[PDB]
Design a protein around this ligand. Structure first.
Ligand SMILES: Nc1nc2c(ncn2[C@@H]2O[C@H](COP(=O)(O)OP(=O)(O)O)[C@@H](O)[C@H]2O)c(=O)[nH]1
Ligand SMILES: [Mg+2]
Lengths: 67, 428
Protein backbone atom coordinates (compact mmCIF):
# COMPACT_ATOMS: atom_id res chain seq x y z
CA UNK A 1 0.00 0.00 0.00
CA UNK A 2 2.83 2.51 0.79
CA UNK A 3 4.40 1.49 -2.57
CA UNK A 4 1.09 2.20 -4.41
CA UNK A 5 0.73 5.59 -2.66
CA UNK A 6 4.22 6.52 -3.89
CA UNK A 7 3.30 5.45 -7.43
CA UNK A 8 0.08 7.56 -7.48
CA UNK A 9 1.77 10.80 -6.45
CA UNK A 10 4.67 10.08 -8.88
CA UNK A 11 2.19 9.47 -11.69
CA UNK A 12 0.50 12.80 -10.83
CA UNK A 13 3.87 14.67 -11.02
CA UNK A 14 4.79 12.95 -14.29
CA UNK A 15 1.52 13.74 -16.07
CA UNK A 16 1.68 17.35 -14.87
CA UNK A 17 5.30 17.70 -16.08
CA UNK A 18 4.35 16.06 -19.42
CA UNK A 19 1.56 18.58 -19.85
CA UNK A 20 3.87 21.54 -19.14
CA UNK A 21 6.50 19.99 -21.47
CA UNK A 22 4.08 19.35 -24.37
CA UNK A 23 2.64 22.87 -23.97
CA UNK A 24 6.13 24.46 -24.04
CA UNK A 25 7.25 22.55 -27.18
CA UNK A 26 3.99 22.93 -29.15
CA UNK A 27 4.19 26.67 -28.60
CA UNK A 28 7.89 26.75 -29.69
CA UNK A 29 7.11 24.80 -32.87
CA UNK A 30 4.10 27.11 -33.65
CA UNK A 31 6.07 30.36 -33.08
CA UNK A 32 8.99 29.08 -35.22
CA UNK A 33 6.77 27.83 -38.07
CA UNK A 34 4.87 31.13 -37.97
CA UNK A 35 8.03 33.32 -38.04
CA UNK A 36 9.32 31.24 -41.01
CA UNK A 37 5.98 31.52 -42.88
CA UNK A 38 5.66 35.25 -42.41
CA UNK A 39 9.29 35.72 -43.46
CA UNK A 40 8.70 33.73 -46.67
CA UNK A 41 5.53 35.78 -47.43
CA UNK A 42 7.49 39.08 -47.09
CA UNK A 43 10.56 37.68 -48.96
CA UNK A 44 8.32 36.73 -51.93
CA UNK A 45 6.72 40.22 -51.89
CA UNK A 46 10.16 41.89 -51.92
CA UNK A 47 11.37 39.59 -54.74
CA UNK A 48 8.34 40.69 -56.89
CA UNK A 49 9.20 44.34 -56.30
CA UNK A 50 12.89 43.58 -57.06
CA UNK A 51 11.78 42.24 -60.46
CA UNK A 52 9.93 45.55 -61.02
CA UNK A 53 13.21 47.45 -60.39
CA UNK A 54 15.03 45.07 -62.77
CA UNK A 55 12.33 45.49 -65.49
CA UNK A 56 12.51 49.30 -65.19
CA UNK A 57 16.30 49.13 -65.78
CA UNK A 58 15.52 47.20 -68.98
CA UNK A 59 13.02 49.88 -70.11
CA UNK A 60 15.52 52.76 -69.60
CA UNK A 61 18.15 50.61 -71.39
CA UNK A 62 15.75 49.92 -74.31
CA UNK A 63 15.08 53.69 -74.74
CA UNK A 64 18.80 54.65 -74.93
CA UNK A 65 19.63 51.71 -77.25
CA UNK A 66 17.25 53.19 -79.82
CA UNK A 67 20.39 55.27 -80.59
CA UNK B 1 -6.42 -1.07 28.34
CA UNK B 2 -7.31 2.32 29.66
CA UNK B 3 -6.54 5.19 27.20
CA UNK B 4 -8.45 5.93 23.99
CA UNK B 5 -6.88 8.33 21.46
CA UNK B 6 -9.45 10.45 19.64
CA UNK B 7 -8.91 11.83 16.11
CA UNK B 8 -11.23 14.17 14.19
CA UNK B 9 -10.58 14.85 10.48
CA UNK B 10 -12.07 17.39 8.07
CA UNK B 11 -15.13 19.66 8.32
CA UNK B 12 -17.74 17.11 9.41
CA UNK B 13 -15.22 15.17 11.55
CA UNK B 14 -14.24 18.31 13.47
CA UNK B 15 -17.79 19.65 13.82
CA UNK B 16 -19.22 16.34 15.22
CA UNK B 17 -15.98 15.92 17.17
CA UNK B 18 -16.22 19.30 18.91
CA UNK B 19 -19.89 18.56 19.84
CA UNK B 20 -18.94 15.11 21.28
CA UNK B 21 -16.37 16.78 23.56
CA UNK B 22 -18.87 19.50 24.61
CA UNK B 23 -21.41 16.81 25.58
CA UNK B 24 -19.06 14.36 27.34
CA UNK B 25 -17.19 17.14 29.21
CA UNK B 26 -20.58 18.34 30.55
CA UNK B 27 -21.43 14.72 31.57
CA UNK B 28 -18.08 14.31 33.36
CA UNK B 29 -18.22 17.67 35.21
CA UNK B 30 -15.45 19.28 33.09
CA UNK B 31 -15.76 22.95 32.05
CA UNK B 32 -14.19 24.89 29.06
CA UNK B 33 -10.98 25.69 31.03
CA UNK B 34 -10.49 22.04 32.02
CA UNK B 35 -11.66 22.33 35.63
CA UNK B 36 -13.75 19.70 37.39
CA UNK B 37 -16.91 21.16 38.96
CA UNK B 38 -19.22 18.14 39.49
CA UNK B 39 -20.69 16.26 42.46
CA UNK B 40 -20.45 12.51 41.67
CA UNK B 41 -17.54 10.07 42.03
CA UNK B 42 -18.85 8.15 38.99
CA UNK B 43 -17.79 11.20 36.90
CA UNK B 44 -14.08 10.74 37.67
CA UNK B 45 -13.37 7.01 38.19
CA UNK B 46 -12.79 6.22 34.47
CA UNK B 47 -12.05 9.75 33.18
CA UNK B 48 -8.57 8.59 32.00
CA UNK B 49 -10.19 6.75 29.09
CA UNK B 50 -10.73 10.15 27.33
CA UNK B 51 -8.83 12.76 29.37
CA UNK B 52 -5.21 13.45 30.19
CA UNK B 53 -4.43 14.81 33.62
CA UNK B 54 -2.19 17.90 33.56
CA UNK B 55 -0.78 18.84 37.03
CA UNK B 56 -3.10 21.87 36.64
CA UNK B 57 -5.11 20.13 38.05
CA UNK B 58 -6.70 20.24 34.59
CA UNK B 59 -8.37 17.65 32.35
CA UNK B 60 -7.22 17.73 28.70
CA UNK B 61 -9.06 15.73 25.96
CA UNK B 62 -6.87 13.04 24.31
CA UNK B 63 -7.99 14.53 21.01
CA UNK B 64 -6.13 15.39 17.80
CA UNK B 65 -7.74 17.90 15.42
CA UNK B 66 -6.90 17.45 11.73
CA UNK B 67 -7.85 19.31 8.52
CA UNK B 68 -6.30 20.30 5.17
CA UNK B 69 -7.94 23.75 5.47
CA UNK B 70 -7.86 26.10 8.54
CA UNK B 71 -11.51 27.37 8.53
CA UNK B 72 -13.42 24.68 10.53
CA UNK B 73 -10.64 24.34 13.12
CA UNK B 74 -10.47 28.09 13.75
CA UNK B 75 -14.21 27.72 14.33
CA UNK B 76 -13.56 24.92 16.86
CA UNK B 77 -10.96 27.08 18.69
CA UNK B 78 -13.35 30.02 19.12
CA UNK B 79 -16.29 27.65 19.83
CA UNK B 80 -17.84 26.84 23.28
CA UNK B 81 -15.30 24.27 24.58
CA UNK B 82 -12.58 25.51 22.18
CA UNK B 83 -9.98 26.37 24.84
CA UNK B 84 -9.99 22.84 26.35
CA UNK B 85 -8.01 21.25 23.48
CA UNK B 86 -4.22 20.93 23.68
CA UNK B 87 -3.10 23.63 21.12
CA UNK B 88 -0.23 21.37 19.89
CA UNK B 89 -2.93 18.86 18.78
CA UNK B 90 -4.23 21.23 16.08
CA UNK B 91 -2.61 19.89 12.86
CA UNK B 92 -3.71 21.71 9.72
CA UNK B 93 -2.60 22.49 6.15
CA UNK B 94 -3.70 25.40 3.95
CA UNK B 95 -4.81 24.11 0.55
CA UNK B 96 -7.97 22.09 1.37
CA UNK B 97 -8.99 18.85 -0.39
CA UNK B 98 -11.76 20.08 -2.68
CA UNK B 99 -14.17 17.26 -1.75
CA UNK B 100 -11.74 14.97 -3.50
CA UNK B 101 -10.74 11.60 -1.89
CA UNK B 102 -7.54 11.49 -4.10
CA UNK B 103 -6.36 14.84 -2.77
CA UNK B 104 -6.95 13.69 0.84
CA UNK B 105 -5.49 10.20 0.42
CA UNK B 106 -2.70 10.64 -2.21
CA UNK B 107 -1.60 14.22 -2.79
CA UNK B 108 -2.52 16.95 -0.30
CA UNK B 109 -3.08 14.54 2.66
CA UNK B 110 0.20 12.69 2.04
CA UNK B 111 1.97 16.02 2.63
CA UNK B 112 0.39 16.48 6.12
CA UNK B 113 0.04 12.90 7.46
CA UNK B 114 3.51 12.55 9.04
CA UNK B 115 3.03 15.53 11.33
CA UNK B 116 -0.36 14.07 12.44
CA UNK B 117 1.36 10.76 13.26
CA UNK B 118 3.97 12.71 15.28
CA UNK B 119 1.09 14.06 17.44
CA UNK B 120 -0.49 10.58 17.58
CA UNK B 121 2.88 9.18 18.79
CA UNK B 122 3.33 11.79 21.59
CA UNK B 123 -0.16 10.95 22.95
CA UNK B 124 0.42 7.17 22.59
CA UNK B 125 3.76 7.39 24.41
CA UNK B 126 2.01 9.05 27.37
CA UNK B 127 -0.41 6.06 27.71
CA UNK B 128 -0.38 3.62 30.60
CA UNK B 129 -2.06 1.03 28.29
CA UNK B 130 -3.50 2.36 25.00
CA UNK B 131 -6.81 0.73 23.97
CA UNK B 132 -6.73 2.09 20.43
CA UNK B 133 -8.29 4.88 18.47
CA UNK B 134 -11.57 6.54 17.63
CA UNK B 135 -11.88 8.63 14.44
CA UNK B 136 -14.76 10.95 13.56
CA UNK B 137 -14.99 11.90 9.85
CA UNK B 138 -17.41 11.92 6.93
CA UNK B 139 -17.00 9.65 3.93
CA UNK B 140 -18.37 12.15 1.31
CA UNK B 141 -15.71 14.88 1.35
CA UNK B 142 -11.98 14.83 0.78
CA UNK B 143 -10.17 15.27 4.07
CA UNK B 144 -12.22 13.15 6.53
CA UNK B 145 -12.66 10.60 3.78
CA UNK B 146 -9.31 10.38 1.85
CA UNK B 147 -6.95 11.66 4.45
CA UNK B 148 -8.90 10.03 7.32
CA UNK B 149 -8.57 6.61 5.68
CA UNK B 150 -4.90 7.33 4.93
CA UNK B 151 -4.38 8.02 8.67
CA UNK B 152 -6.14 4.76 9.61
CA UNK B 153 -3.81 2.74 7.34
CA UNK B 154 -0.73 4.48 8.80
CA UNK B 155 -2.02 4.06 12.35
CA UNK B 156 -2.58 0.36 11.74
CA UNK B 157 1.01 -0.03 10.41
CA UNK B 158 2.57 1.59 13.45
CA UNK B 159 0.04 0.04 16.01
CA UNK B 160 -1.23 -3.21 14.51
CA UNK B 161 -2.34 -4.61 17.87
CA UNK B 162 -4.55 -1.62 18.84
CA UNK B 163 -8.29 -1.28 18.16
CA UNK B 164 -9.48 1.10 15.43
CA UNK B 165 -13.01 2.48 15.87
CA UNK B 166 -14.78 5.04 13.62
CA UNK B 167 -17.83 7.20 13.58
CA UNK B 168 -18.31 7.47 9.82
CA UNK B 169 -20.88 9.89 8.38
CA UNK B 170 -22.37 8.48 5.16
CA UNK B 171 -23.45 10.96 2.43
CA UNK B 172 -26.99 11.34 1.18
CA UNK B 173 -28.41 13.26 -1.86
CA UNK B 174 -30.92 14.73 0.68
CA UNK B 175 -28.11 16.60 2.43
CA UNK B 176 -25.46 16.87 -0.28
CA UNK B 177 -22.51 19.11 -0.99
CA UNK B 178 -21.22 17.68 -4.29
CA UNK B 179 -22.13 15.01 -6.83
CA UNK B 180 -18.81 13.14 -6.13
CA UNK B 181 -19.86 11.98 -2.61
CA UNK B 182 -20.69 8.41 -3.73
CA UNK B 183 -17.17 8.13 -5.26
CA UNK B 184 -15.55 9.39 -2.06
CA UNK B 185 -17.76 7.10 0.11
CA UNK B 186 -17.07 3.93 -1.98
CA UNK B 187 -13.30 4.52 -1.96
CA UNK B 188 -13.58 5.04 1.83
CA UNK B 189 -15.78 2.01 2.57
CA UNK B 190 -13.15 -0.21 0.85
CA UNK B 191 -10.63 1.15 3.39
CA UNK B 192 -12.98 0.76 6.40
CA UNK B 193 -13.80 -2.85 5.61
CA UNK B 194 -10.01 -3.73 5.83
CA UNK B 195 -8.67 -1.41 8.49
CA UNK B 196 -11.27 -0.78 11.22
CA UNK B 197 -12.44 -3.13 13.93
CA UNK B 198 -15.76 -1.38 14.40
CA UNK B 199 -17.55 1.45 12.56
CA UNK B 200 -20.71 3.35 13.52
CA UNK B 201 -22.55 4.17 10.25
CA UNK B 202 -23.98 7.59 10.84
CA UNK B 203 -26.24 8.09 7.88
CA UNK B 204 -27.06 11.67 6.85
CA UNK B 205 -30.20 10.35 5.15
CA UNK B 206 -31.47 8.99 8.52
CA UNK B 207 -30.46 12.15 10.41
CA UNK B 208 -32.29 14.31 7.87
CA UNK B 209 -35.48 12.18 7.99
CA UNK B 210 -35.52 12.12 11.77
CA UNK B 211 -35.20 15.89 11.90
CA UNK B 212 -37.99 16.27 9.28
CA UNK B 213 -40.52 13.44 9.99
CA UNK B 214 -40.03 13.10 13.76
CA UNK B 215 -38.60 16.36 15.13
CA UNK B 216 -40.87 18.40 12.79
CA UNK B 217 -37.99 20.65 11.67
CA UNK B 218 -39.08 21.64 8.13
CA UNK B 219 -35.55 22.72 7.13
CA UNK B 220 -32.77 20.79 9.08
CA UNK B 221 -29.30 22.39 9.41
CA UNK B 222 -25.96 20.60 10.06
CA UNK B 223 -26.38 21.82 13.67
CA UNK B 224 -29.70 19.89 13.97
CA UNK B 225 -28.06 16.78 12.42
CA UNK B 226 -25.15 17.04 14.84
CA UNK B 227 -27.51 17.21 17.85
CA UNK B 228 -28.55 13.66 17.00
CA UNK B 229 -24.90 12.56 16.36
CA UNK B 230 -23.55 13.83 19.73
CA UNK B 231 -26.45 12.24 21.69
CA UNK B 232 -25.79 8.95 19.88
CA UNK B 233 -22.00 9.25 20.43
CA UNK B 234 -22.44 9.95 24.16
CA UNK B 235 -24.75 6.92 24.38
CA UNK B 236 -22.55 4.40 22.55
CA UNK B 237 -19.44 5.26 24.64
CA UNK B 238 -21.26 5.22 28.07
CA UNK B 239 -19.81 1.80 29.01
CA UNK B 240 -16.26 2.91 28.09
CA UNK B 241 -16.56 6.07 30.20
CA UNK B 242 -18.50 5.09 33.37
CA UNK B 243 -18.01 2.34 35.98
CA UNK B 244 -20.85 -0.22 35.89
CA UNK B 245 -21.75 -3.91 36.26
CA UNK B 246 -20.24 -4.45 32.78
CA UNK B 247 -16.93 -2.67 32.32
CA UNK B 248 -16.20 -2.29 28.68
CA UNK B 249 -13.35 -1.25 26.38
CA UNK B 250 -12.94 -1.09 22.57
CA UNK B 251 -11.63 -4.67 22.27
CA UNK B 252 -14.45 -6.26 24.34
CA UNK B 253 -16.97 -4.30 22.21
CA UNK B 254 -15.34 -5.76 19.07
CA UNK B 255 -15.09 -9.34 20.35
CA UNK B 256 -18.74 -9.44 21.39
CA UNK B 257 -20.27 -7.44 18.47
CA UNK B 258 -18.31 -8.76 15.45
CA UNK B 259 -18.70 -12.47 14.58
CA UNK B 260 -16.91 -12.13 11.18
CA UNK B 261 -14.16 -9.52 10.86
CA UNK B 262 -15.54 -7.66 7.74
CA UNK B 263 -19.07 -7.34 9.23
CA UNK B 264 -18.26 -4.57 11.63
CA UNK B 265 -20.54 -1.74 10.56
CA UNK B 266 -23.00 -0.86 13.29
CA UNK B 267 -26.47 0.71 13.06
CA UNK B 268 -26.84 2.99 16.07
CA UNK B 269 -30.20 4.18 17.51
CA UNK B 270 -31.34 6.52 20.29
CA UNK B 271 -34.49 7.19 22.37
CA UNK B 272 -36.18 9.48 23.22
CA UNK B 273 -35.68 11.50 20.04
CA UNK B 274 -35.43 15.20 20.82
CA UNK B 275 -34.31 18.47 19.19
CA UNK B 276 -32.39 21.46 20.62
CA UNK B 277 -34.62 24.10 22.26
CA UNK B 278 -38.15 22.66 22.47
CA UNK B 279 -37.87 19.59 24.71
CA UNK B 280 -40.49 17.31 26.32
CA UNK B 281 -41.44 17.44 30.01
CA UNK B 282 -43.32 14.13 29.83
CA UNK B 283 -41.11 11.36 31.32
CA UNK B 284 -40.61 8.08 29.42
CA UNK B 285 -41.60 4.63 30.75
CA UNK B 286 -39.23 1.67 30.36
CA UNK B 287 -41.66 -0.02 27.90
CA UNK B 288 -41.73 3.20 25.83
CA UNK B 289 -37.91 3.54 25.75
CA UNK B 290 -37.50 -0.08 24.71
CA UNK B 291 -40.17 0.17 21.97
CA UNK B 292 -38.72 3.46 20.63
CA UNK B 293 -35.00 2.40 20.70
CA UNK B 294 -35.84 -0.54 18.40
CA UNK B 295 -38.05 1.47 16.03
CA UNK B 296 -36.71 2.07 12.48
CA UNK B 297 -37.51 5.81 13.00
CA UNK B 298 -34.98 6.00 15.85
CA UNK B 299 -32.02 4.44 13.82
CA UNK B 300 -29.10 6.65 12.69
CA UNK B 301 -28.62 4.51 9.54
CA UNK B 302 -31.46 4.61 6.97
CA UNK B 303 -32.11 0.88 6.81
CA UNK B 304 -35.20 -1.13 7.60
CA UNK B 305 -34.35 -3.57 10.49
CA UNK B 306 -37.22 -5.82 9.28
CA UNK B 307 -35.43 -6.33 5.95
CA UNK B 308 -32.69 -8.20 7.79
CA UNK B 309 -31.57 -9.88 11.00
CA UNK B 310 -29.57 -8.76 14.01
CA UNK B 311 -26.36 -10.68 14.50
CA UNK B 312 -25.67 -8.90 17.82
CA UNK B 313 -27.17 -5.98 19.77
CA UNK B 314 -25.81 -3.93 22.67
CA UNK B 315 -28.30 -1.68 24.49
CA UNK B 316 -27.55 0.89 27.10
CA UNK B 317 -30.16 2.44 29.46
CA UNK B 318 -29.32 5.67 31.26
CA UNK B 319 -31.10 7.22 34.27
CA UNK B 320 -32.69 6.00 37.53
CA UNK B 321 -35.09 3.20 36.48
CA UNK B 322 -35.93 -0.39 37.45
CA UNK B 323 -33.16 -2.69 36.15
CA UNK B 324 -35.67 -5.53 36.71
CA UNK B 325 -38.15 -3.76 34.38
CA UNK B 326 -35.30 -3.08 31.87
CA UNK B 327 -34.39 -6.82 31.81
CA UNK B 328 -38.09 -7.78 31.44
CA UNK B 329 -38.72 -5.36 28.55
CA UNK B 330 -35.53 -6.32 26.70
CA UNK B 331 -36.41 -9.98 27.06
CA UNK B 332 -39.99 -9.15 26.03
CA UNK B 333 -39.00 -7.47 22.75
CA UNK B 334 -36.63 -10.41 21.84
CA UNK B 335 -39.21 -13.13 22.68
CA UNK B 336 -41.88 -11.31 20.62
CA UNK B 337 -39.67 -10.66 17.53
CA UNK B 338 -37.21 -13.61 17.66
CA UNK B 339 -37.25 -14.18 13.86
CA UNK B 340 -35.30 -10.87 13.52
CA UNK B 341 -32.48 -12.14 15.76
CA UNK B 342 -30.27 -14.93 14.42
CA UNK B 343 -30.87 -18.12 16.42
CA UNK B 344 -27.28 -19.36 16.00
CA UNK B 345 -25.77 -16.78 18.32
CA UNK B 346 -27.21 -17.49 21.82
CA UNK B 347 -27.74 -14.45 24.12
CA UNK B 348 -26.89 -12.05 21.22
CA UNK B 349 -28.69 -9.16 22.93
CA UNK B 350 -26.85 -7.57 25.80
CA UNK B 351 -28.05 -4.80 28.09
CA UNK B 352 -26.16 -2.46 30.39
CA UNK B 353 -27.29 0.29 32.72
CA UNK B 354 -25.78 3.57 33.90
CA UNK B 355 -27.31 5.80 36.58
CA UNK B 356 -26.09 9.08 35.06
CA UNK B 357 -28.63 10.22 32.43
CA UNK B 358 -27.56 12.57 29.60
CA UNK B 359 -28.18 16.38 29.91
CA UNK B 360 -31.85 17.38 29.76
CA UNK B 361 -33.32 13.88 30.13
CA UNK B 362 -34.53 11.74 33.03
CA UNK B 363 -33.95 8.56 31.01
CA UNK B 364 -32.60 7.42 27.67
CA UNK B 365 -31.81 4.31 25.71
CA UNK B 366 -28.96 3.92 23.21
CA UNK B 367 -28.98 1.16 20.64
CA UNK B 368 -25.95 -0.51 18.89
CA UNK B 369 -27.00 -3.06 16.26
CA UNK B 370 -24.97 -5.28 14.02
CA UNK B 371 -27.79 -6.01 11.52
CA UNK B 372 -27.55 -7.58 8.06
CA UNK B 373 -30.00 -4.82 6.95
CA UNK B 374 -27.02 -2.40 6.85
CA UNK B 375 -26.50 -3.86 3.38
CA UNK B 376 -29.23 -1.38 2.26
CA UNK B 377 -26.94 1.56 3.02
CA UNK B 378 -24.09 0.05 1.00
CA UNK B 379 -26.39 -0.90 -1.88
CA UNK B 380 -27.69 2.70 -2.04
CA UNK B 381 -24.10 4.10 -2.28
CA UNK B 382 -23.27 1.41 -4.84
CA UNK B 383 -26.23 2.43 -7.10
CA UNK B 384 -25.18 6.10 -6.92
CA UNK B 385 -21.51 5.15 -7.65
CA UNK B 386 -22.50 3.04 -10.71
CA UNK B 387 -24.89 5.72 -12.09
CA UNK B 388 -21.89 8.03 -12.57
CA UNK B 389 -19.14 5.48 -13.00
CA UNK B 390 -20.75 3.68 -15.96
CA UNK B 391 -20.13 6.93 -17.97
CA UNK B 392 -16.88 7.78 -16.13
CA UNK B 393 -18.54 11.07 -15.11
CA UNK B 394 -16.52 13.43 -12.89
CA UNK B 395 -13.51 11.02 -12.98
CA UNK B 396 -11.01 13.65 -14.21
CA UNK B 397 -11.06 15.22 -10.71
CA UNK B 398 -9.36 11.93 -9.54
CA UNK B 399 -7.18 10.95 -12.55
CA UNK B 400 -5.78 14.48 -12.35
CA UNK B 401 -4.29 13.46 -8.98
CA UNK B 402 -2.75 10.32 -10.43
CA UNK B 403 -5.46 7.72 -9.70
CA UNK B 404 -6.56 5.13 -12.24
CA UNK B 405 -10.10 3.86 -12.95
CA UNK B 406 -8.94 0.35 -11.86
CA UNK B 407 -8.89 1.60 -8.27
CA UNK B 408 -12.62 2.62 -8.59
CA UNK B 409 -13.50 -0.80 -10.10
CA UNK B 410 -11.69 -2.54 -7.20
CA UNK B 411 -13.35 -0.47 -4.43
CA UNK B 412 -16.82 -1.06 -6.04
CA UNK B 413 -16.24 -4.85 -6.21
CA UNK B 414 -15.13 -4.96 -2.55
CA UNK B 415 -18.22 -3.00 -1.43
CA UNK B 416 -20.48 -5.30 -3.51
CA UNK B 417 -18.76 -8.32 -1.83
CA UNK B 418 -19.53 -6.81 1.56
CA UNK B 419 -23.22 -6.51 0.51
CA UNK B 420 -23.50 -10.15 -0.57
CA UNK B 421 -21.57 -11.21 2.54
CA UNK B 422 -24.40 -9.62 4.60
CA UNK B 423 -27.04 -11.32 2.43
CA UNK B 424 -25.33 -14.65 3.19
CA UNK B 425 -26.11 -14.44 6.98
CA UNK B 426 -29.60 -13.00 6.55
CA UNK B 427 -30.80 -16.33 5.09
CA UNK B 428 -29.04 -18.61 7.62
N1 LIG C 1 -23.87 15.13 9.81
C1 LIG C 1 -23.01 16.07 9.34
N2 LIG C 1 -22.59 15.95 8.06
C2 LIG C 1 -21.72 16.87 7.54
C3 LIG C 1 -21.26 17.99 8.33
N3 LIG C 1 -20.42 18.73 7.57
C4 LIG C 1 -20.36 18.12 6.37
N4 LIG C 1 -21.14 17.02 6.36
C5 LIG C 1 -21.31 16.03 5.29
O1 LIG C 1 -19.98 15.58 5.03
C6 LIG C 1 -19.76 15.40 3.62
C7 LIG C 1 -18.72 16.39 3.06
O2 LIG C 1 -17.51 16.21 3.81
P1 LIG C 1 -16.79 17.37 4.65
O3 LIG C 1 -16.43 16.82 5.99
O4 LIG C 1 -17.47 18.69 4.50
O5 LIG C 1 -15.42 17.48 3.76
P2 LIG C 1 -13.90 17.41 4.28
O6 LIG C 1 -13.67 18.61 5.14
O7 LIG C 1 -13.09 17.36 2.98
O8 LIG C 1 -13.73 16.07 5.01
C8 LIG C 1 -21.13 15.58 3.00
O9 LIG C 1 -21.67 14.25 2.92
C9 LIG C 1 -21.86 16.49 3.97
O10 LIG C 1 -23.25 16.23 3.99
C10 LIG C 1 -21.76 18.06 9.69
O11 LIG C 1 -21.38 19.01 10.40
N5 LIG C 1 -22.60 17.10 10.11
MG1 LIG D 1 -17.53 20.58 3.32
Amino acid sequence: KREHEREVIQKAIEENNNFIKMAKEKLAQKMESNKENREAHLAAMLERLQEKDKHAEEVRKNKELKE
Amino acid sequence: MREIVHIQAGQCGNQIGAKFWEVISDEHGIDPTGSYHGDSDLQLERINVYYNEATGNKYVPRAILVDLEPGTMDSVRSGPFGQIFRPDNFVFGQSGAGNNWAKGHYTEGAELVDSVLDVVRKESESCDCLQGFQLTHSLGGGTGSGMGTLLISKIREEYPDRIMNTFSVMPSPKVSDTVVEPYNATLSVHQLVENTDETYCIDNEALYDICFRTLKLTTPTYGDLNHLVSATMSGVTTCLRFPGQLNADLRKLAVNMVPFPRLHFFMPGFAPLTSRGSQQYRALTVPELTQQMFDSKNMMAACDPRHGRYLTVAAIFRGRMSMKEVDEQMLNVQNKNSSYFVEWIPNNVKTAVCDIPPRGLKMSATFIGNSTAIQELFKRISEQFTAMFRRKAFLHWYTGEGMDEMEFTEAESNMNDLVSEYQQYQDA
